C-alpha cells in the first residue's frame, strides 16, 4: 500500500465493518480533491474517488463558517474533512455505482472546510474504488468468509446423495434443483447472514443540498 482511501476502506472490510478496530493512525484529517459536485459529489485521494455522505449537521455548520460558498459548486476545488467516520451498508449494487456485491463502505462526513487557495496536485486519473480489482476481491473475500461460516452452521448431517441414485441411473430421471441447498437461515433469495452491525447514521441526499442553495 499508497491510496489513503483504498487502505481505509480495505481495513474496514478486513475488520467486519467495525470502525473502532481500524488503525488509529488512519483516523487523521482527510485532504481530498473534489472531482465532481453534482449530480454526484465525488472526491479523490490522488488515486481513487469515493462519495462522501454529509450529515445534516455537517452542511449546516459548513453553511455557517463559510457563508455563500456553495457546496454543489466545489468541483475542482479541495476540501479538508476534519471529522469523519466509516460505516458499512447493504445496498442495491445495480443502482449504486459506489458499491459492490450489494455492499458499500460509506465515508460519513461530520465537518469539512474548503481551501480555494489555488490548491493543486498533479494526479493520475481517479477511478471508482468499487471497480478496482484488488478492492473488489477484498469485498469478495469478506462475503466468502461470511458465506462459509453460515454454510458450516446451517448445513449438517452429511446429507450425501445416495449412491444408488447415480450408479444405476439407466431408468432414472431427476430434476437438477434436487442439488440446490440453502446456504443459511435467510428470508428471501439473497444471502444476508452477516455479522457486522449495519451502521445507520442519517445523511443528506445530494439534491437536497442543491435546493437548499438554489431552489
Amino acid at each position: 500500500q499508497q491510496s489513503a482511501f483504498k487502505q481505509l476502506y480495505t481495513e474496514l472490510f478486513n475488520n467486519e465493518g467495525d470502525f473502532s478496530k481500524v488503525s488509529s493512525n488512519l483516523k487523521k484529517p482527510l485532504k481530498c480533491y473534489v472531482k465532481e459536485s453534482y449530480p454526484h459529489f465525488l472526491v479523490t485521494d490522488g488515486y481513487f474517488f469515493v462519495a462522501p455522505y454529509f450529515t445534516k449537521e455537517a452542511v449546516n455548520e459548513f453553511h455557517a463558517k463559510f457563508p455563500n460558498v456553495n457546496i454543489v459548486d466545489l468541483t475542482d476545488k479541495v476540501i479538508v474533512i476534519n471529522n469523519w467516520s466509516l460505516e458499512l451498508r447493504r445496498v442495491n449494487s445495480a443502482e449504486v455505482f459506489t458499491s459492490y456485491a450489494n455492499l458499500e463502505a460509506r465515508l460519513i462526513v461530520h465537518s469539512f472546510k474548503p481551501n480555494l487557495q489555488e490548491r493543486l496536485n498533479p494526479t493520475r486519473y481517479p477511478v471508482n474504488l468499487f471497480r478496482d480489482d484488488e478492492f473488489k476481491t477484498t469485498i469478495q473475500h469478506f462475503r466468502h468468509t461470511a458465506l462459509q461460516a453460515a454454510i458450516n452452521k446451517t448445513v449438517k448431517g452429511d446429507n450425501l446423495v445416495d449412491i444408488s441414485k447415480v450408479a444405476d441411473a439407466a431408468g432414472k430421471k431427476g430434476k437438477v434443483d434436487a442439488g440446490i441447498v440453502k446456504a443459511s437461515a435467510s428470508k428471501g433469495d439473497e444471502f444476508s447472514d452477516f455479522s457486522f452491525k449495519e451502521g445507520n447514521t442519517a445523511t443528506l441526499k445530494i439534491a437536497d443540498i442543491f435546493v437548499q442553495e438554489k431552489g
Binding site: 481513487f48 493520475r124 480489482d133 484488488e134 476481491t137 462459509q148 452429511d158 430434476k175 434443483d177 441447498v181
Partner: protein, 449 residues
C-alpha cells in the same frame, strides 16, 4: 461511382474528399469526449505505406461522430476498413485522414479472415466474402469493380502479417518495465487465463515476452472476444501503483484489447514462445489470504474446446431450456464452499457393486463418494449453494485428487494428501474448472484433476 486511392498517393494539397481501402493495425475504442462528440482513432496501412524502413509505418485515421454507434469497434488487427469522403492533412509529420461520420463520411469493415470476430464468437458463416461485417449508416453498397480491390488487399494483408510483426517493438512496452513509464503505454501479451470475477467483469491473466505476469479488468460486454491462449495487443494501459497483492494494469474507456488475424507472425510466435506461469500462483498457497485467483483443476484435453455453462443455467434452467436439455455433458467453473462428508476419512467408502450400496471404510470395493457444495459468479448473490458430486464407482473422476481410492482410516499418506486438498479447495479465491455428466438429476465430475 467512387475512385479509391492508395494511402501514399492520396493528395495532401487538394483538401477534397478522398476514398480508400486499408488494413487496420491499431485503434482506440470508440470513446466520448463531451456531450455530443464521440471519437475513434486508428492506424492504417496499405501496399504503399506499411513500413518505415523496419519498424512499421502507417497513416492515421480519425473518425468523428455524434453517436457511439456510428463508429467502428476494432476487435482484431488485420481486418480491412473502407472509408468514403475523408480529408487528408499532415499532423506532426504523419499522414492523417479525417472523416466526419456525423456529416457525409462513411466506413465499412471487411473481414480478412474467413469469419469476423463476432462471427467466430457466435459460430456463424459470413454471408459472402464481399459483405461488410459492420458499417455506418443504414446502407452499404459495394460495386463489382471493388471486389478485386478488396480481394487483393486481403491477399496482401495476409502476406504482410505473415512476414512482418506489424505491431513492432516500438509500439509497446515490456511488462517488466511498465512501472518505469510516466503515463500510459501499450502491451502485447498472451492470455493465460480468463477469470469471471463477477456478472459484468472478466479478469485477464497476462504474460508477455518479458516473462512478467499482470492482471487487468476486462468488461464482458466491451471485450467479449478475449480467449485463453490467444495473443492480444492492449492499446493504452497504466501501471496501478495502488495494487499491492498483485501486478495490475489499468485501462481507460478509450483503451482497446485487440486480437490478430490468423496469419499474424507475431501472434503465432508469442503463442508458442510464451508458456503458462504458475509462480504468481505457487507463492499463494503459502498465504492465509490470496487476492490472486487460483484455478486448481485442469480439464481433459478433449474438452478444452467445450464451452462453459454457468451454475445458474446448470441448476435453475437445465430442466427448461431447450439447448441445455439436449446435453448431458457440460463444462463449468466454481468455488467450493464446503465438502461433505466433513470427515475427510469418510471421503472413500466401500462399494458393493451388486446391492448398489456404500459403507464406512470400516468395509468394501474402494471408491470416492464426495459431495461438493459450490457457488459461482452467476449465483454469487443468492442464498443457495449447489451440489456437485465426485462419485467414482463407475470411473468418472477416479483420478480427481491424484490419489487412488484407499481406506483413509489406514493409509495415512492418502488421508494427508486429501486433507491438504480439502483446505485448498475451500480456501477463498480457489476455483475449479470441471466437466460434469448429468445423471438422474445430479452432476458428476469427470475428466478433471
Amino acid at each position: 461511382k467512387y475512385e479509391y486511392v492508395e494511402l501514399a498517393k492520396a493528395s495532401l494539397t487538394s483538401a477534397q474528399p478522398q476514398h480508400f481501402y486499408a488494413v487496420v493495425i491499431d485503434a482506440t475504442f470508440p470513446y466520448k469526449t463531451n456531450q455530443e462528440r464521440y471519437i475513434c482513432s486508428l492506424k492504417i496501412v496499405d501496399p504503399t505505406l506499411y513500413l518505415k524502413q523496419d519498424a512499421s509505418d502507417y497513416a492515421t485515421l480519425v473518425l468523428y461522430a455524434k453517436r457511439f454507434e456510428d463508429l467502428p469497434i476494432i476487435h482484431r488487427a488485420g481486418d480491412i476498413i473502407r472509408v468514403h469522403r475523408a480529408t487528408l492533412r499532415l499532423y506532426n509529420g504523419q499522414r492523417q485522414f479525417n472523416a466526419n461520420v456525423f456529416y457525409s463520411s462513411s466506413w465499412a469493415l471487411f473481414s480478412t479472415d474467413k469469419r469476423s470476430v463476432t462471427q467466430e464468437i457466435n459460430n456463424q458463416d459470413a454471408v459472402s466474402d464481399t459483405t461488410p461485417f459492420s458499417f455506418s449508416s443504414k446502407h452499404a453498397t459495394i460495386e463489382k469493380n471493388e471486389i478485386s480491390i478488396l480481394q487483393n488487399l486481403r491477399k496482401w494483408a495476409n502476406q504482410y502479417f505473415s512476414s512482418y510483426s506489424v505491431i513492432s517493438s516500438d509500439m509497446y512496452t515490456a511488462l517488466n518495465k511498465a512501472q518505469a513509464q510516466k503515463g500510459d503505454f501499450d502491451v502485447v501479451a498472451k492470455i493465460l487465463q480468463v477469470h469471471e470475477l463477477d456478472e459484468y467483469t472478466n479478469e485477464l491473466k497476462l504474460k508477455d515476452a518479458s516473462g512478467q505476469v499482470f492482471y487487468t479488468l476486462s468488461l464482458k460486454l466491451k471485450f467479449p472476444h478475449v480467449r485463453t491462449g490467444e495473443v492480444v495487443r492492449i492499446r493504452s494501459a497504466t501501471y496501478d501503483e495502488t495494487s499491492t497483492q498483485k501486478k495490475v494494469l489499468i485501462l481507460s474507456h478509450y483503451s482497446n484489447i485487440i486480437t490478430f488475424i490468423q496469419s499474424s507472425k507475431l501472434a503465432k510466435e508469442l503463442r508458442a514462445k510464451i508458456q503458462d506461469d504458475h509462480s504468481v500462483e505457487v507463492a499463494s498457497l503459502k498465504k492465509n489470504v490470496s487476492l490472486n485467483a487460483v484455478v486448481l483443476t485442469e480439464v481433459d484435453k478433449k474438452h478444452a474446446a467445450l464451452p462453459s455453462t454457468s451454475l445458474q443455467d446448470l441448476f435453475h434452467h437445465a430442466d427448461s431450456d431447450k439447448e441445455l436439455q439436449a446435453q448431458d455433458t457440460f463444462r463449468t467453473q466454481f468455488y467450493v464452499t464446503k465438502i461433505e462428508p466433513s470427515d475427510v476419512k469418510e471421503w472413500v467408502k466401500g462399494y458393493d457393486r451388486k446391492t448398489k450400496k456404500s459403507s464406512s471404510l470400516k468395509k468394501g470395493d474402494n471408491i470416492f463418494q464426495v459431495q461438493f457444495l459450490v457457488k459461482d459468479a452467476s449465483t454469487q448473490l443468492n442464498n443457495n449453494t449447489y451440489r456437485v458430486l465426485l462419485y467414482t464407482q463407475d470411473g468418472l473422476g477416479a483420478n480427481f485428487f491424484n490419489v487412488k481410492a484407499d481406506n483413509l482410516h489406514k493409509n495415512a499418506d492418502a488421508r494427508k494428501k486429501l486433507e491438504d486438498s480439502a483446505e485448498l479447495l475451500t480456501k477463498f479465491n480457489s476455483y475449479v474448472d470441471a466437466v460434469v455428466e448429468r445423471r438422474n438429476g445430479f452432476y458428476l465430475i469427470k475428466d478433471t484433476k
